[PDB]
């Protein structure tokens, strides 16, 4: 007997066919376009979308005025609107099945800091975030997979203690300044 918790999950599922040529080209295109590290980072978002589509398909088989359909349908739709994947004027349970992986991949902090002009590429954004140069609402974040909530889009800035903001220069400029 211990005061410990053993609850955990796996966040991805592997594909059934390991060497499907059409799927290998489709997934590398996403990796290259959004600057991902490995195929496991595509199967994670794809798993999350697969679980969202499965809840919607189960709610869509209930009565249109089923009390559980109107409670957990509104919650799912509101959750999808909040992060910016679904539109404000499309809060219908049939528009969830029209969602794509690219919608979910566009809300990553890595994509957003690049699309806001902080970084010169999608690979510069990765290192900028991992090197503690970016903050969201006074909090320093160094997780590139941080999903940006809609009313956080305006509060992504350079960190207050970084050479790219008002901070001191890094070790290299300091060392070369004393070189002469």
């Amino acid at each position: 007997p211990v005061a410990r918790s053993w609850v955990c999950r796996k966040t991805y599922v592997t594909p059934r066919r390991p060497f499907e040529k059409s799927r290998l080209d489709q997934e590398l295109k996403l990796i290259g376009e959004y600057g991902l590290r490995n195929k496991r980072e595509v199967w994670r978002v794809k798993f999350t979308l697969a679980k969202i589509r499965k809840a919607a398909r189960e709610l869509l088989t209930l009565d249109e005025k089923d009390p559980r359909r109107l409670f957990e349908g509104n919650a799912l739709l509101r959750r999808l609107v909040r992060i910016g994947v679904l539109d404000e004027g499309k809060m219908k349970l049939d528009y969830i099945l029209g969602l794509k992986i690219e919608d979910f991949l566009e809300r990553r902090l890595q994509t957003q800091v690049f699309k806001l002009g902080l970084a010169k590429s999608i690979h510069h954004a990765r290192v900028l975030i991992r090197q503690r140069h970016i903050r969201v609402r006074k909090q320093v974040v160094n997780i590139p997979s941080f999903i940006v909530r809609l009313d956080s889009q305006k509060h992504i800035d350079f960190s207050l203690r970084s050479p790219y903001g008002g901070g001191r220069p890094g070790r290299v400029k300091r060392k070369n300044a004393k070189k002469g």
Binding site: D25, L28, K29, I31, G32, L36, R37, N38, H123, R126
Partner: protein, 50 residues
């Protein structure tokens, strides 16, 4: 049979050393190279000879 020819060709093969070469990229930069190679800048194969 007669257990006297074990290791024959492995011991017969001449020994050739590996050429030293520039190290390989790893992680997010290795998979960027493949994307650039296959999609942005391009009936045969990657290892087609002649």
């Amino acid at each position: 049979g007669s257990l006297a020819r074990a290791g024959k060709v492995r011991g017969q093969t001449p020994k050739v050393a590996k050429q030293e070469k520039k190290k390989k990229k790893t992680g997010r930069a290795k998979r960027r190279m493949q994307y650039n190679r296959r999609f942005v800048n391009v009936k045969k194969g990657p290892n087609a000879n002649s």
